[PDB]
Amino acid sequence: YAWNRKRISNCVADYSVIYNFAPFFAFKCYGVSPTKLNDLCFTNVYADSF
Amino acid sequence: ALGKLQDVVNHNAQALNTLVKQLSSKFGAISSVLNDILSRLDPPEAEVQ
Amino acid sequence: PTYGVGHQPYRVVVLSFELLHAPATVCGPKKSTNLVKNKCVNFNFNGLTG
């Protein structure tokens, strides 16, 4: 009900480490490829945790 | 006076413009740019887009 | 803890992005290359390839 939202901005993101150590049974992406995240630039990045 | 000839010229230009305009249409896909689709998706779903 | 799978607590994190509609502040690890003028090149500017 009170899910935490964190803004991510002004950083360079290495998504490779998320793969390198992972306890995540489900890693499902809808609008972007998982392997292509390293080659792209983004804004309006938000992480919602619950 | 010379409306008929100009009209023909207008139609041809208009047709080309419309065809050019059609490149900016998503057509039910995530993006209208092929390069973005290749850069953002894996081949099984990129093929669909 | 005694319950089986499907009722156990699961932590979910949702990453939300926007695609190319604003200036980007979050980018991948890819290294910047020098700029070349008056030649046909395949360029990647902020995840936009042309």
UniProtKB/Swiss-Prot annotation, chain A:
Superkingdom: Viruses
SUBUNIT field: Binds to host ACE2. RBD also interacts with the N-linked glycan on 'Asn-90' of ACE2. Cleavage of S generates a polybasic C-terminal sequence on S1 that binds to host Neuropilin-1 (NRP1) and Neuropilin-2 (NRP2) receptors. Interacts with host integrin alpha-5/beta-1 (ITGA5:ITGB1) and with ACE2 in complex with integrin alpha-5/beta-1 (ITGA5:ITGB1). May interact via cytoplasmic c-terminus with M protein. May interact (via N-terminus) with host bilirubin and biliverdin, thereby preventing antibody binding to the SARS-CoV-2 spike NTD via an allosteric mechanism.
Function: Attaches the virion to the cell membrane by interacting with host receptor, initiating the infection. The major receptor is host ACE2. When S2/S2' has been cleaved, binding to the receptor triggers direct fusion at the cell membrane. When S2/S2' has not been cleaved, binding to the receptor results in internalization of the virus by endocytosis using host TFRC and GRM2 and leading to fusion of the virion membrane with the host endosomal membrane. Alternatively, may use NRP1/NRP2 and integrin as entry receptors.
Name this polypeptide is given: Spike protein S1
Protein's organism: Severe acute respiratory syndrome coronavirus 2
